[PDB]
Amino acid sequence: RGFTTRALHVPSNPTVEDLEQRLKNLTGALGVLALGSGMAAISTAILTLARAGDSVVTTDRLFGHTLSLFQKTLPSFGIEVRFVDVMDSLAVEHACDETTKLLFLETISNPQLQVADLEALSKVVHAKGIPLVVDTTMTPPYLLEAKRLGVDIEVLSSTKFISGGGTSVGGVLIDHGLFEWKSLPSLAPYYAKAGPMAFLYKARKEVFQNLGPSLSPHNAYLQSLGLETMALRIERSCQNAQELAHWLLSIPQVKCVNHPSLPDSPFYAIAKRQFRYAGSILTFELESKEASYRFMDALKLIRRATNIHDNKSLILSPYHVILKLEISPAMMRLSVGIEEIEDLKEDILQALC
Amino acid sequence: RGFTTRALHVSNPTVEDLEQRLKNLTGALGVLALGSGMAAISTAILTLARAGDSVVTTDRLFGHTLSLFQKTLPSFGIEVRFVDVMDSLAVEHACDETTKLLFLETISNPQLQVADLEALSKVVHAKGIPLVVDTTMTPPYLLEAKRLGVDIEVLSSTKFIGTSVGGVLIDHGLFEWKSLPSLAPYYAKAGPMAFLYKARKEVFQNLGPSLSPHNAYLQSLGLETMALRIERSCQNAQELAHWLLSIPQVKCVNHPSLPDSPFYAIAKRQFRYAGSILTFELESKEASYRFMDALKLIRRATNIHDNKSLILSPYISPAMMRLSVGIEEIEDLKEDILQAL
Amino acid sequence: RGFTTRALHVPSNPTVEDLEQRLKNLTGALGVLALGSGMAAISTAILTLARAGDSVVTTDRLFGHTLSLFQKTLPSFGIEVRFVDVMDSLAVEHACDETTKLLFLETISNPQLQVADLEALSKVVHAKGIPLVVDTTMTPPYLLEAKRLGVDIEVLSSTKFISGGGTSVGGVLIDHGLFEWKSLPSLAPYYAKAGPMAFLYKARKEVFQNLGPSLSPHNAYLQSLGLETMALRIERSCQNAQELAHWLLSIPQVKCVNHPSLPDSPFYAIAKRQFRYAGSILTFELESKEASYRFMDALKLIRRATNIHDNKSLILSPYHVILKLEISPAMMRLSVGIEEIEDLKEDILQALC
Amino acid sequence: RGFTTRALHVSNPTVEDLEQRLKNLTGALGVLALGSGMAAISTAILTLARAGDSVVTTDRLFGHTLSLFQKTLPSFGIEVRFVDVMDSLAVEHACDETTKLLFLETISNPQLQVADLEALSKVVHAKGIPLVVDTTMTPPYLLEAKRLGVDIEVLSSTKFIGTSVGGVLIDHGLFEWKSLPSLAPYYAKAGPMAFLYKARKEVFQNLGPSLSPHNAYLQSLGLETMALRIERSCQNAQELAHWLLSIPQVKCVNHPSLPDSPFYAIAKRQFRYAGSILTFELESKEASYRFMDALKLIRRATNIHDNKSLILSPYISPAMMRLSVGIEEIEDLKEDILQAL
């Protein structure tokens, strides 16, 4: 059964529930919780497993809100945070001990597009009886079947919808039905009540209920509507990014094109094993910081902005926004949209001259 | 300036507009709109309390707010002390140097107990502890919380029926936040705005209970008619509580506006009206069930503070019903109750 | 049973239907049709009764869109329009002949606040077997029970809702169950199919369906929500206007205060007979056009604008906007809102000095 | 520039934005968004025709569009002449000096008859009569109507399920409007914009089929994925019509993309794809009913052009079903049809 047909034909709060049922139908999951934002999904998954006196392990590649959750909020709830290089399975193994209640990471880092080996990391952590929680925003369900790679809990930010009145956001939390929850002292009391639903039960009836990141039915409705054309939009988006990365290799003025679909990518093999397509974000450089700025000022379709995964193609210089130390001032990050490929190539050519 | 006037004449422009309206209505230092009532309560608490601290609250909580204090906060290493908030001495003895706030509601549910806010603010302020109050039962038109010493006001916003929910966090500009180790580090960056700065840029941003612009628009629309709806609703509830005293099959009417109510004086000092919820009993559980089955306007349901009048049996006496009084003309409410007897 | 309780407890397109049922419950009508706008209600009522070769009679007090419908659109469908002074029952009687399929007017004219005698005019037209169609926007159902005054068809513009994205509008068409439709050759074929529902049947299944002024369920939902607080808002609004008109009489700088609730009003008796309150619009003058402008520039709550029946109090000089010949350049029209009366008095005092 | 690019990169700002998108997608002189498809058709007609005029349209209308031409327009003193639009001679003989437009659809329903637009535009232009076409079956991504001589394009917008509806009126910048007595008086004020000026400031303003900003926002969102959804939908329908030819229990498949279709050549000349609706029969009415009862994905319903695939029996053969093909993966559509046989 295809993705688009599963978004369309699913086998109190009826709009939110209907969204949750779609998402479950789309992933084959044990169950799903829709929440008010991506940060709310992340923090709900963590706070379901971790409490004062525990630790958690995560990537040292976080910034902005996700970073601040781990640097400021979690230590205020008595949770020790261990930052590690998630590219290194041995550093991950050594950071984990009996206080460690989960490993959290992202499917593709931003802006470097590093791709951790999820299955390998799932095994390192499963051997110690620790669950794996992954933010799959860069590679949502049509691109990734996280259950096959050992991912216990999948979290993501939902399709955003921008209006005059502000941006409508959401989050999604997915239990893949992999981890034996009853083996954790955190969830054993909920196993008595809910059986295999122990994680989802605490997450929903306790953590979500008490911290209250409610999802509006109006947002839920828009997100369901988005799920209908997700496969179609992602196919377009991701084929455009794959073709752009390849074509960028032919442009004299362009250097250091980075996308995991390219054969010279360090993450070429792992991406091909994990993903239908390695997401719709790529990176590249011109000769200098100043050539990159002049290029960007000259684009007529692709716009400068902060968001990613818009229908519109968007670009920015991650350096100008502030480890920064490891990124080139001449690097630009391109979030590729659903425009016809010929127009995007044409805009980029034109902005070069 | 009147309340209605101030609701009407004052990134995320709809949410910000809602926040400015609420700040105008309240005269507050500042205001944060959030995805729900629970988000507002938990955001206020987690701005002040962290692992190794304690908090004091009323022993009259149930449902979600109770589960936050029984399960979620002790998991964050926060010790919760439950006390009888009717007793200012027990409140005093529960607070020590670890205690980072007192939390309570303005009118308890379903008993309608009214704590003496100004008396409790003094007990807690005398130890350098802020007062955080859920004013859902008595929102801004009914209560000026800052006059009673309330540092942080929290409430559930007007719901719109899925159901669109919200919450509101209000800093009344009372507590000197730089004197607190929890906020002194923000004081450099935000001055008097240090509570709001932490709450918005750290706790809210990281736990993510985002308020939808669509909910925010509706709640703004709602604020315009708030004074008008609360007047009607609260005069109806006052009148009905009185009138109920005259009905031979009715016993034990409870509302703080009744002279014989234990909370008569405290409610009169604190509130324009003591909320739109009242309680009463018939002869017995069975007479109460028959009465409710026979109602044609007032409907049985769980929600409170709807435009529609709603009733339920909380079982506290098994014969007790709780009536959330709505904005229907008083004559039809009286008539439906009579007919159902 | 009170108005507010009838808006709350009503005894395909479920949101639109629910609105229609509320409105019927609020008016005691035979039936109701909700439409995309006020102009759509007006034109639907007219085009249900009138066709090429017929005439219609209406007030000579129309302007803007309503006027343009009668001056340009209706004559293009072969309908003769006869404009008359509706203050004059004898001019009305003489304008009507066997080709005349309805009399259309408004409950209170704008900006002059003239109040035609509806019951008298209903009798003039009923005697000739002609129905009466009335726009009751100035005096909607809580203020007026149009059936008691002989009004066959009540039409109105719905409560508007302004957002970033533009204004959401609607219209309402009400059959009061008064006229015997089967006596008209226009509606007799529909009487065969629908009985007493003949008017509503043609209006809905034909005129509305074929010209297509559809009402959005999103607008319908907002309008239903508005109906809940209509009585409360109108009571406030209308008491404010009544008290303002009275109080304005005490202000040295103020002249020619016009509102039908004032005893010296020419429409004092007819308004008291017809309305709970004579609407929330009043008019007054200062000494000169220039004193009026300086007053208006100095108001701090009451704002200059074109709309009326907002929650906010709004004012304008009808002269500056362009018969104009019969209106004073120093006259201002005040649409009174729901602000506390003390603030409105205070703003007006302040803007005078 | 591609279609998707143009949907994305272009008082009442949401409606105006929708209109600018549609103008970008079409290269038109201008565009009016309206409250429905019927509002768009009636607005185009009533801009051109008045009492004492005639109009010509196809004899293949039913439901609302048919009732407008049978009941509403003759009541406005407009004579309506119904003709076989497949026959350019009958079209010519129906037009005289009173005739102010020819109206038809791009693909008739349920027969799927495809009129030769460019041939009919010539017949009608040779008499100074504009061509007004409802392109609902073949919207802008599928058809560039201006190339085929179509003066005014009208269509129902993408619906969102109550149900939010819309319509669109498009002036392709082809007809010289000053040569017409109906519009010459606007030409002074509006120049080339005289059709649009009358339609918007007079007919639309006075009959009031206002488009909600909320519907308008959704339809804008919809336009962004229009090319993608129509590709999928129309390739599915092409493929299914072919594949249906191979199924022993299927007879009489109808789709203009089939070589044996009478409209094969005309559809290929006019359309990227000939719409997403096809027709077929089983052995008998009863076999057709059993088949439809047994479908698990494709649902019986009245709507067309949904994301979901929909089917019904229009009874034209009683055994005929009409399938509105949606955007499901082709394998699952094939599989549901097989399983149901």
Side-chain angles (χ1 to χ4, degrees), chain A residues 1-9 11-147 149-159 161-263 265-271 273-293 295-306 308-318 321 327-353, chain B residues 1-110 112-175 177-188 190-200 202-282 284-285 287-289 291-298 300-314 317-341, chain C residues 1-9 11-147 149-159 161-263 265-271 273-293 295-306 308-318 321 327-353, chain D residues 1-110 112-175 177-188 190-200 202-282 284-285 287-289 291-298 300-314 317-341:
Chain A
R1 232 205 196 198
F3 198 91
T4 303
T5 136
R6 288 182 271 124
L8 278 39
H9 301 102
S12 19
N13 250 285
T15 308
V16 178
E17 191 180 37
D18 168 80
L19 203 226
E20 291 175 340
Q21 302 280 38
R22 289 196 202 210
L23 259 353
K24 177 179 184 310
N25 204 42
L26 289 173
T27 62
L30 216 210
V32 173
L33 208 204
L35 300 94
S37 71
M39 287 310 297
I42 296 175
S43 68
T44 275
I46 293 168
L47 261 10
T48 297
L49 296 163
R51 325 197 266 163
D54 297 339
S55 63
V56 288
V57 182
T58 177
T59 272
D60 60 5
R61 310 326 268 173
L62 308 176
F63 64 92
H65 307 332
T66 188
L67 182 57
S68 174
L69 169 65
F70 281 92
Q71 280 203 326
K72 297 150 185 174
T73 303
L74 265 19
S76 303
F77 300 162
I79 298 146
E80 175 198 357
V81 179
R82 295 170 193 159
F83 295 92
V84 302
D85 181 353
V86 78
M87 267 359 190
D88 182 351
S89 57
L90 264 172
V92 177
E93 184 175 300
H94 298 329
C96 288
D97 60 10
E98 65 284 350
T99 68
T100 306
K101 301 315 192 199
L102 76 265
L103 199 212
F104 173 78
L105 66 153
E106 312 161 326
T107 247
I108 303 187
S109 73
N110 182 171
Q112 296 165 302
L113 319 178
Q114 291 185 354
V115 174
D117 182 346
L118 307 177
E119 178 168 26
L121 300 174
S122 73
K123 289 175 175 198
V124 160
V125 95
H126 293 160
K128 273 162 189 268
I130 301 170
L132 173 65
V133 170
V134 175
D135 183 348
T136 56
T137 306
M138 306 280 268
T139 62
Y142 174 71
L143 291 192
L144 164 57
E145 279 174 69
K147 189 194 183 168
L149 306 184
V151 173
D152 306 298
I153 303 294
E154 164 166 8
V155 160
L156 65 165
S157 303
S158 311
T159 309
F161 293 82
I162 292 188
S163 66
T167 299
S168 310
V169 140
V172 180
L173 185 158
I174 296 162
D175 180 344
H176 281 293
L178 217 49
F179 204 90
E180 289 291 324
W181 304 127
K182 67 167 180 185
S183 74
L184 309 180
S186 75
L187 261 46
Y190 304 81
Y191 177 82
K193 166 89 186 176
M197 307 295 287
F199 186 105
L200 286 160
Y201 183 86
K202 192 184 168 176
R204 181 186 316 268
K205 311 285 165 43
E206 189 185 294
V207 178
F208 171 86
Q209 151 192 286
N210 297 346
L211 298 179
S214 287
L215 177 61
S216 170
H218 307 282
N219 288 216
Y221 170 81
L222 291 176
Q223 292 153 19
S224 281
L225 230 60
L227 287 188
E228 296 184 5
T229 63
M230 172 164 281
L232 294 181
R233 287 159 28 247
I234 293 176
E235 258 324 298
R236 168 54 67 79
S237 193
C238 277
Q239 295 189 35
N240 280 348
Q242 207 168 73
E243 166 65 10
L244 286 165
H246 171 78
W247 173 77
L248 256 22
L249 289 178
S250 68
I251 306 293
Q253 41 267 275
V254 167
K255 306 191 196 262
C256 304
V257 10
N258 166 205
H259 182 84
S261 76
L262 301 177
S265 179
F267 312 98
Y268 181 80
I270 187 61
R273 206 185 282 274
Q274 295 186 339
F275 308 136
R276 194 192 297 279
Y277 295 106
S280 56
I281 312 302
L282 65 80
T283 260
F284 67 98
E285 293 178 24
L286 298 189
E287 45 180 342
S288 63
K289 186 200 178 161
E290 26 287 310
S292 292
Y293 283 32
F295 167 78
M296 279 176 84
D297 287 307
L299 293 161
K300 294 173 180 192
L301 295 179
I302 302 168
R303 282 156 218 175
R304 286 163 120 153
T306 302
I308 60 192
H309 309 311
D310 201 271
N311 285 338
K312 292 158 181 61
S313 298
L314 311 167
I315 195 167
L316 66 49
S317 185
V321 176
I327 80 157
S328 179
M331 189 266 291
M332 293 171 285
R333 190 235 288 143
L334 180 63
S335 172
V336 178
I338 59 166
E339 305 94 346
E340 282 78 27
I341 181 58
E342 300 83 358
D343 300 323
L344 296 170
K345 284 167 170 177
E346 235 283 303
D347 193 32
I348 287 167
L349 256 19
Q350 165 271 329
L352 291 163
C353 293
Chain B
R1 251 205 191 189
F3 199 88
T4 302
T5 118
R6 285 182 277 123
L8 276 38
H9 298 99
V10 172
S11 340
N12 263 278
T14 316
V15 175
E16 182 181 55
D17 182 268
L18 208 209
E19 288 173 349
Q20 306 272 39
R21 282 195 205 201
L22 272 329
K23 178 161 106 95
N24 210 38
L25 288 172
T26 171
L29 220 205
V31 179
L32 209 199
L34 296 97
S36 70
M38 293 317 294
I41 296 165
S42 68
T43 185
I45 290 172
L46 272 16
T47 297
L48 300 161
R50 18 199 273 167
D53 299 340
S54 63
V55 189
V56 183
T57 55
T58 189
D59 55 8
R60 323 311 272 164
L61 302 175
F62 65 86
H64 301 345
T65 186
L66 176 63
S67 166
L68 174 66
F69 285 88
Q70 284 193 322
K71 297 152 186 177
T72 304
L73 270 15
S75 293
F76 291 173
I78 296 151
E79 167 205 350
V80 176
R81 303 163 184 172
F82 295 96
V83 303
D84 178 358
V85 79
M86 287 335 237
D87 183 342
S88 66
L89 259 171
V91 175
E92 194 180 280
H93 298 331
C95 299
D96 65 19
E97 63 291 355
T98 70
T99 299
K100 304 307 174 195
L101 73 264
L102 206 208
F103 172 84
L104 67 148
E105 315 159 325
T106 226
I107 302 188
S108 73
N109 187 166
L112 314 177
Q113 296 190 10
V114 180
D116 185 337
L117 306 175
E118 162 159 28
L120 301 166
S121 70
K122 283 172 184 184
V123 162
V124 89
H125 288 162
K127 276 170 196 213
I129 296 164
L131 180 60
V132 87
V133 180
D134 173 358
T135 56
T136 307
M137 305 281 263
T138 62
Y141 179 67
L142 298 180
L143 167 62
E144 284 174 64
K146 184 186 188 184
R147 295 190 162 275
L148 299 179
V150 164
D151 303 295
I152 299 294
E153 166 163 4
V154 158
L155 64 167
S156 306
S157 323
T158 308
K159 71 170 115 69
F160 296 78
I161 291 188
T163 309
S164 306
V165 151
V168 175
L169 193 154
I170 297 172
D171 187 335
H172 281 293
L174 222 44
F175 201 97
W177 301 121
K178 45 99 171 193
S179 86
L180 295 181
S182 67
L183 295 171
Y186 305 86
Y187 178 79
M193 297 295 297
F195 187 103
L196 290 156
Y197 188 85
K198 193 177 181 196
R200 178 184 319 269
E202 190 179 297
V203 182
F204 171 85
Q205 151 198 287
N206 295 347
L207 300 184
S210 287
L211 180 58
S212 168
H214 308 283
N215 288 211
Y217 172 80
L218 295 172
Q219 294 152 15
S220 272
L221 250 44
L223 282 184
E224 307 186 350
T225 61
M226 175 175 264
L228 297 177
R229 284 162 30 243
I230 294 184
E231 264 312 303
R232 166 60 64 75
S233 188
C234 292
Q235 298 189 31
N236 279 350
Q238 240 176 33
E239 175 55 21
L240 281 162
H242 181 69
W243 173 82
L244 255 16
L245 290 175
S246 73
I247 302 301
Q249 44 263 280
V250 161
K251 335 253 132 112
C252 303
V253 4
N254 178 195
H255 190 77
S257 76
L258 298 179
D260 279 336
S261 165
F263 309 101
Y264 182 75
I266 188 51
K268 212 96 268 149
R269 202 192 289 276
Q270 302 190 331
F271 307 136
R272 197 188 295 277
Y273 297 101
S276 54
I277 311 300
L278 66 81
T279 248
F280 63 105
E281 314 186 21
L282 294 195
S284 67
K285 190 200 173 161
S288 293
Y289 286 26
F291 165 79
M292 283 175 89
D293 285 300
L295 290 162
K296 298 172 175 189
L297 290 177
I298 310 171
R300 293 162 108 146
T302 311
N303 286 331
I304 64 187
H305 307 304
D306 206 86
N307 288 342
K308 283 168 178 71
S309 286
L310 307 168
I311 193 158
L312 57 55
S313 176
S317 176
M320 193 260 293
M321 299 164 278
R322 169 181 36 73
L323 181 67
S324 174
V325 183
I327 56 165
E328 297 93 346
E329 283 76 25
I330 186 54
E331 301 81 357
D332 301 318
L333 289 178
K334 271 170 175 183
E335 230 282 339
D336 190 29
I337 290 158
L338 255 20
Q339 163 271 329
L341 294 158
Chain C
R1 232 205 196 198
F3 198 91
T4 303
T5 136
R6 288 182 271 124
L8 278 39
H9 301 102
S12 19
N13 250 285
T15 308
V16 178
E17 191 180 37
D18 168 80
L19 203 226
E20 291 175 340
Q21 302 280 38
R22 289 196 202 210
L23 259 353
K24 177 179 184 310
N25 204 42
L26 289 173
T27 62
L30 216 210
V32 173
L33 208 204
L35 300 94
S37 71
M39 287 310 297
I42 296 175
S43 68
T44 275
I46 293 168
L47 261 10
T48 297
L49 296 163
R51 325 197 266 163
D54 297 339
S55 63
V56 288
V57 182
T58 177
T59 272
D60 60 5
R61 310 326 268 173
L62 308 176
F63 64 92
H65 307 332
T66 188
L67 182 57
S68 174
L69 169 65
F70 281 92
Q71 280 203 326
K72 297 150 185 174
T73 303
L74 265 19
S76 303
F77 300 162
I79 298 146
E80 175 198 357
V81 179
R82 295 170 193 159
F83 295 92
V84 302
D85 181 353
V86 78
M87 267 359 190
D88 182 351
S89 57
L90 264 172
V92 177
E93 184 175 300
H94 298 329
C96 288
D97 60 10
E98 65 284 350
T99 68
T100 306
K101 301 315 192 199
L102 76 265
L103 199 212
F104 173 78
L105 66 153
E106 312 161 326
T107 247
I108 303 187
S109 73
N110 182 171
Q112 296 165 302
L113 319 178
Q114 291 185 354
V115 174
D117 182 346
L118 307 177
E119 178 168 26
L121 300 174
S122 73
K123 289 175 175 198
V124 160
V125 95
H126 293 160
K128 273 162 189 268
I130 301 170
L132 173 65
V133 170
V134 175
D135 183 348
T136 56
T137 306
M138 306 280 268
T139 62
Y142 174 71
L143 291 192
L144 164 57
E145 279 174 69
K147 189 194 183 168
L149 306 184
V151 173
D152 306 298
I153 303 294
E154 164 166 8
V155 160
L156 65 165
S157 303
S158 311
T159 309
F161 293 82
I162 292 188
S163 66
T167 299
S168 310
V169 140
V172 180
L173 185 158
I174 296 162
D175 180 344
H176 281 293
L178 217 49
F179 204 90
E180 289 291 324
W181 304 127
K182 67 167 180 185
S183 74
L184 309 180
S186 75
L187 261 46
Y190 304 81
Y191 177 82
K193 166 89 186 176
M197 307 295 287
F199 186 105
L200 286 160
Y201 183 86
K202 192 184 168 176
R204 181 186 316 268
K205 311 285 165 43
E206 189 185 294
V207 178
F208 171 86
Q209 151 192 286
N210 297 346
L211 298 179
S214 287
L215 177 61
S216 170
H218 307 282
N219 288 216
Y221 170 81
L222 291 176
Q223 292 153 19
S224 281
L225 230 60
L227 287 188
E228 296 184 5
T229 63
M230 172 164 281
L232 294 181
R233 287 159 28 247
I234 293 176
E235 258 324 298
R236 168 54 67 79
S237 193
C238 277
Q239 295 189 35
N240 280 348
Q242 207 168 73
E243 166 65 10
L244 286 165
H246 171 78
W247 173 77
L248 256 22
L249 289 178
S250 68
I251 306 293
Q253 41 267 275
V254 167
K255 306 191 196 262
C256 304
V257 10
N258 166 205
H259 182 84
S261 76
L262 301 177
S265 179
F267 312 98
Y268 181 80
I270 187 61
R273 206 185 282 274
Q274 295 186 339
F275 308 136
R276 194 192 297 279
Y277 295 106
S280 56
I281 312 302
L282 65 80
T283 260
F284 67 98
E285 293 178 24
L286 298 189
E287 45 180 342
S288 63
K289 186 200 178 161
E290 26 287 310
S292 292
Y293 283 32
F295 167 78
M296 279 176 84
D297 287 307
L299 293 161
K300 294 173 180 192
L301 295 179
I302 302 168
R303 282 156 218 175
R304 286 163 120 153
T306 302
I308 60 192
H309 309 311
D310 201 271
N311 285 338
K312 292 158 181 61
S313 298
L314 311 167
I315 195 167
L316 66 49
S317 185
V321 176
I327 80 157
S328 179
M331 189 266 291
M332 293 171 285
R333 190 235 288 143
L334 180 63
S335 172
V336 178
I338 59 166
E339 305 94 346
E340 282 78 27
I341 181 58
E342 300 83 358
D343 300 323
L344 296 170
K345 284 167 170 177
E346 235 283 303
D347 193 32
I348 287 167
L349 256 19
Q350 165 271 329
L352 291 163
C353 293
Chain D
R1 251 205 191 189
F3 199 88
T4 302
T5 118
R6 285 182 277 123
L8 276 38
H9 298 99
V10 172
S11 340
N12 263 278
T14 316
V15 175
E16 182 181 55
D17 182 268
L18 208 209
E19 288 173 349
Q20 306 272 39
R21 282 195 205 201
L22 272 329
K23 178 161 106 95
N24 210 38
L25 288 172
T26 171
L29 220 205
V31 179
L32 209 199
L34 296 97
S36 70
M38 293 317 294
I41 296 165
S42 68
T43 185
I45 290 172
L46 272 16
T47 297
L48 300 161
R50 18 199 273 167
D53 299 340
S54 63
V55 189
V56 183
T57 55
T58 189
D59 55 8
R60 323 311 272 164
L61 302 175
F62 65 86
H64 301 345
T65 186
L66 176 63
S67 166
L68 174 66
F69 285 88
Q70 284 193 322
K71 297 152 186 177
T72 304
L73 270 15
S75 293
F76 291 173
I78 296 151
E79 167 205 350
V80 176
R81 303 163 184 172
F82 295 96
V83 303
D84 178 358
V85 79
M86 287 335 237
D87 183 342
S88 66
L89 259 171
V91 175
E92 194 180 280
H93 298 331
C95 299
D96 65 19
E97 63 291 355
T98 70
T99 299
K100 304 307 174 195
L101 73 264
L102 206 208
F103 172 84
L104 67 148
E105 315 159 325
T106 226
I107 302 188
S108 73
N109 187 166
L112 314 177
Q113 296 190 10
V114 180
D116 185 337
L117 306 175
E118 162 159 28
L120 301 166
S121 70
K122 283 172 184 184
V123 162
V124 89
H125 288 162
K127 276 170 196 213
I129 296 164
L131 180 60
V132 87
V133 180
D134 173 358
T135 56
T136 307
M137 305 281 263
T138 62
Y141 179 67
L142 298 180
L143 167 62
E144 284 174 64
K146 184 186 188 184
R147 295 190 162 275
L148 299 179
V150 164
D151 303 295
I152 299 294
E153 166 163 4
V154 158
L155 64 167
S156 306
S157 323
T158 308
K159 71 170 115 69
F160 296 78
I161 291 188
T163 309
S164 306
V165 151
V168 175
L169 193 154
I170 297 172
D171 187 335
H172 281 293
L174 222 44
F175 201 97
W177 301 121
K178 45 99 171 193
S179 86
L180 295 181
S182 67
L183 295 171
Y186 305 86
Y187 178 79
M193 297 295 297
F195 187 103
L196 290 156
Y197 188 85
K198 193 177 181 196
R200 178 184 319 269
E202 190 179 297
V203 182
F204 171 85
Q205 151 198 287
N206 295 347
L207 300 184
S210 287
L211 180 58
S212 168
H214 308 283
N215 288 211
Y217 172 80
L218 295 172
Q219 294 152 15
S220 272
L221 250 44
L223 282 184
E224 307 186 350
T225 61
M226 175 175 264
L228 297 177
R229 284 162 30 243
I230 294 184
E231 264 312 303
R232 166 60 64 75
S233 188
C234 292
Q235 298 189 31
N236 279 350
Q238 240 176 33
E239 175 55 21
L240 281 162
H242 181 69
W243 173 82
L244 255 16
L245 290 175
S246 73
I247 302 301
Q249 44 263 280
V250 161
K251 335 253 132 112
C252 303
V253 4
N254 178 195
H255 190 77
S257 76
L258 298 179
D260 279 336
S261 165
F263 309 101
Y264 182 75
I266 188 51
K268 212 96 268 149
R269 202 192 289 276
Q270 302 190 331
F271 307 136
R272 197 188 295 277
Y273 297 101
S276 54
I277 311 300
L278 66 81
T279 248
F280 63 105
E281 314 186 21
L282 294 195
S284 67
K285 190 200 173 161
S288 293
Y289 286 26
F291 165 79
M292 283 175 89
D293 285 300
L295 290 162
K296 298 172 175 189
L297 290 177
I298 310 171
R300 293 162 108 146
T302 311
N303 286 331
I304 64 187
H305 307 304
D306 206 86
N307 288 342
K308 283 168 178 71
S309 286
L310 307 168
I311 193 158
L312 57 55
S313 176
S317 176
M320 193 260 293
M321 299 164 278
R322 169 181 36 73
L323 181 67
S324 174
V325 183
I327 56 165
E328 297 93 346
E329 283 76 25
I330 186 54
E331 301 81 357
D332 301 318
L333 289 178
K334 271 170 175 183
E335 230 282 339
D336 190 29
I337 290 158
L338 255 20
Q339 163 271 329
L341 294 158

